[PDB]
């Protein structure tokens, strides 16, 4: 069916499919009666009441058949849903089937566009793809090699045992002198052990060499990259890759090391049983045992990371910003994962531990954690499980009696206790910002935005003393992101450009450079400004904004640019640059016996809370040159009819 065909597209189209189904015509129906629907001549019914009415009841009857199909399967849910869908459909169109037909028609019709527009497979006729592939190889290698060694150690151990047994046998029985020259039958046996031992030692070394080398990539590339993405991701960037891939690489090399350790033990047990001047096991004994633990210790300390940065469940929109007295959560996790580690790692949270500013910086506020300070890392069934501790129940508290842009950090300590084995693990979250009142979130978020967009390290906490600058090519992206995360759409080239200039003047360059002072520093700043627009958009213009029926960012300069020489009615929707509250306004052109340009005093939520913007756009009215009221709003930008465009949004 056309329905099926759609569910077979890239998540970018099926996402638009989503935005075609609301409670008016429940998608539940569009799917459970897709073959019936796709069949009917909706275009016709959209024009003839009787056909429409006939089909409306047919549609209802088709629902009844579907209800009974579910009754058989006892699918209590769908029975209930179908039931509701029918009841809805019913009292929404049983008096106007012509419109329900028009709905189904355009809905199916708009689906095709998407399948037609989804054939961009023409524009489809290795970066990380290859990288990821190599690591799997080295890692796999390390693995295999360990097993190979473990296999010769066993062959090594056996020979020695026979060998021993054979010697003992001779020197334990009842011209014999010349026959005692059989000592060579031993001399031979020895040259074997020596050679086999030297061999094992070689491989164990080679193995270490490799391992370390492969461990460098894993910890110095993969780990670092993932950490950086986690940052952007927390800042509104693309979804961060889960750990599973790392968690696997780490966990594998880890097992290998752990085994080499066992191998080293096995080797000494063979030394006890037998040694000699220049025995390799004895010579390498130490170096090896040490190289191994060295690698293994580094490995497992690198694996202890913050999987979910500090976040307040109440303001999930702003991760790294913590409000005093409000509860928050963080989640730690060890990328290694060995059963021999379950419940053996008690993790403790420390706020601002090892911080200079606690003394260095003057006034530097100081807070104290209040909830549960310690948690033990458990396993939790993912598709691969994972070894991690999570902290719900954390509260920050002010211990009292630059401005609020001071950074603090959360510390996580734990330790591995085993036989004559003890490793201390510690790691910290990205810098945090503590605030007292909600009003600071925007500002606070600004800091986090700056910090994470520029720094790569997890600690400095003094970043805002010499705030770097930002390459517009970079600030611009981060900004789009701020939108493409509160709404279904980000900022575009045109919108970005206006913003570019309002920061870099006219000579806007991808390599421009914006000081942090020209971002969150006679009326309020940029970020605070951009922020309050997102506020407005969110609580008063989402659909209009999402559907792209808002230009939002044009300079009054480029404003007329497009508005000059254009359909008299034509108007434009933009956000005010003036208001320190966030407001939109419109501008349009008129002919008055060149073009005349007009714009309304920006509308703020103060208004929009009383009358919908679309409604305002609808009933607006001004004095025409003929001293007779009428509203100049005729065409949206590319010549769309006022009603044509904002039609669905109209209150009534």
């Amino acid at each position: 069916s056309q329905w099926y065909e759609l569910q077979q597209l890239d998540s970018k189209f099926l996402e638009q499919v989503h935005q075609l189904y609301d409670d008016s015509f429940p998608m539940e129906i569009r799917q459970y009666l897709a073959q019936w629907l796709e069949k009917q001549d909706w275009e016709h019914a959209a024009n003839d009441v009787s056909f429409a009415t006939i089909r409306f009841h047919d549609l209802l009857s088709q629902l009844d058949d579907q209800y009974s199909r579910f009754s058989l399967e006892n699918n209590f849910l769908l029975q209930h849903n179908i039931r509701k869908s029918k009841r809805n459909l019913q009292d929404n169109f049983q008096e106007d089937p012509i419109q329900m037909s028009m709905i189904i028609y355009s809905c199916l019709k708009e689906e095709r566009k998407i399948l037609e527009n989804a054939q961009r497979f023409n524009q489809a006729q290795t970066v990380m793809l290859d990288k990821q592939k190599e690591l799997d190889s080295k890692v796999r290698n390390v693995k295999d090699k360990v097993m190979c060694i473990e296999h010769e150690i066993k062959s090594l151990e056996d020979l020695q045992d026979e060998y021993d047994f054979k010697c003992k046998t001779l020197q334990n029985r009842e011209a014999k002198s010349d026959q005692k020259q059989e000592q060579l039958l031993l001399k031979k046996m020895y040259l074997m052990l020596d050679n086999k031992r030297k061999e094992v030692v070689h491989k164990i070394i080679e193995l270490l060499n490799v391992t370390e080398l492969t461990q460098n990539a894993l910890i110095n590339d993969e780990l670092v990259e993932w950490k950086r993405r986690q940052q952007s991701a927390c800042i509104g960037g693309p979804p961060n890759a889960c750990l599973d891939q790392l968690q696997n690489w780490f966990t594998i090399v880890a097992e290998s090391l752990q085994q080499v350790r066992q191998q080293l033990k096995k080797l000494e047990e063979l030394e006890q049983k037998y040694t000699y001047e220049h025995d390799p096991i004895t010579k390498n004994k130490q170096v090896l045992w040490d190289r191994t633990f060295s690698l293994f210790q580094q490995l497992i300390q690198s694996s202890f990371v913050v999987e979910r940065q500090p976040c307040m469940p109440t303001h999930p929109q702003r991760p790294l910003v913590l409000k005093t007295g409000v509860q928050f959560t963080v989640k730690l996790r060890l990328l290694v994962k060995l059963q021999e580690l379950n419940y053996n790692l008690k993790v403790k949270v420390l706020f601002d531990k090892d911080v200079n500013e606690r003394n260095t910086v003057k006034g530097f506020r100081k807070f104290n954690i209040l909830g549960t300070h310690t948690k033990v890392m458990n396993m939790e069934e993912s598709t691969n499980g994972s070894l991690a501790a999570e902290f719900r129940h954390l509260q920050l508290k002010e211990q009292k009696n630059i401005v609020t842009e001071e950074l603090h950090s959360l510390s996580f300590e734990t330790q591995l206790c085993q036989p004559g084995l003890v490793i201390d693990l510690e790691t910290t979250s990205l810098p945090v910002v503590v605030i007292s009142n909600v009003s600071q979130l925007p500002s606070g978020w600004a800091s986090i935005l700056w910090y994470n967009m520029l720094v790569a390290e997890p600690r400095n906490l003094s970043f805002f003393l010499t705030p770097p600058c930002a390459r517009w090519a970079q600030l611009s992206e981060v900004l789009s992101w701020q939108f493409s995360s509160v709404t279904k759409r980000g900022l575009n080239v045109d919108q970005l450009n206006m913003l570019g200039e309002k920061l870099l003047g006219p000579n806007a360059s991808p390599d421009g450079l914006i000081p942090w002072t020209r971002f969150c520093k006679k009326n309020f700043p940029f970020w605070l400004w951009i922020e309050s627009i997102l506020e407005l958009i969110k609580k008063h213009l989402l659909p209009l904004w999402n559907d792209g029926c808002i230009m939002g960012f044009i300079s009054k300069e480029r404003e007329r640019a497009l508005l000059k020489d254009q359909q008299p009615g034509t108007f434009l929707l933009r956000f005010s640059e003036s208001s320190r509250e966030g407001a939109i306004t419109f501008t349009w052109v008129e002919r008055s016996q060149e073009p005349d340009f007009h714009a309304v005093e920006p509308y703020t939520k103060k208004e929009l809370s009383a009358v919908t913007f679309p409604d305002i756009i609808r009933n607006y009215k001004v004095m025409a040159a003929e001293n007779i009221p009428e509203n100049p709003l005729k065409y949206l930008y590319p010549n769309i009819d006022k009603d044509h465009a904002f039609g669905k949004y109209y209150s009534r």
């Binding site: 007009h598 005093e601 509308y603």
Partner: peptide, 5 residues
């Protein structure tokens, strides 16, 4: 801003 609400 030349025109009123």
């Amino acid at each position: 801003y030349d025109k009123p609400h």
